[PDB]
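Researcher: Here's my situation. A collaborator sent me these components and asked whether they could plausibly form a single complex. I don't have experimental data yet, so a predicted model of the whole assembly would be a useful starting point for our discussion.
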Amino acid sequence: KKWTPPRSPFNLVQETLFHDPWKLLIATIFLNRTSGKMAIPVLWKFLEKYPSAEVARTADWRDVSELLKPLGLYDLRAKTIVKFSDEYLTKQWKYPIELHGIGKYGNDSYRIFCVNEWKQVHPEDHKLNKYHDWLWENHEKLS
DNA sequence: CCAGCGGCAGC
DNA sequence: GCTGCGCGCTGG
Ligand code: NA
């Protein structure tokens, strides 16, 4: 009875990343004011070089920024990713909105995909809303 | 060819 | 409430 969020016709990247809350949350950061068409290909390159919060928190942010260059917001998000990964591992938190760089959208993603709290979430992100409305409409069918 | 636009911190 | 951050996709 582990929480496994169902695959949707929308194929949000969160659907494949929920096993690793850090990776899911990094994905939300990559999608800040960035089309998924650009962000997600670069996300795989980032995760090949920085596969865990454990190593990402030790990274030189200037190296992360180089990798993020084609996405825009590269210095901002490089610094965010290092600090976020540090807090992810060393701060006691219940919801990741408590962590630097995660706001309502990343937190809503976590509460739908990483824990079984989707019924309490009220997303404002259009992609999250499509998944969330679809869950509400189909949850009794999927049990 | 070109302007609009796809979260979060912090003040 | 507001601003800084930034690239490339996209519609026409
Ligand atoms: Na936060």
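Model: Some features of this prediction you could bring to your collaborator: The first helix of chain A runs from residue 14 to 17. The radius of gyration of chain A is 15 Å.
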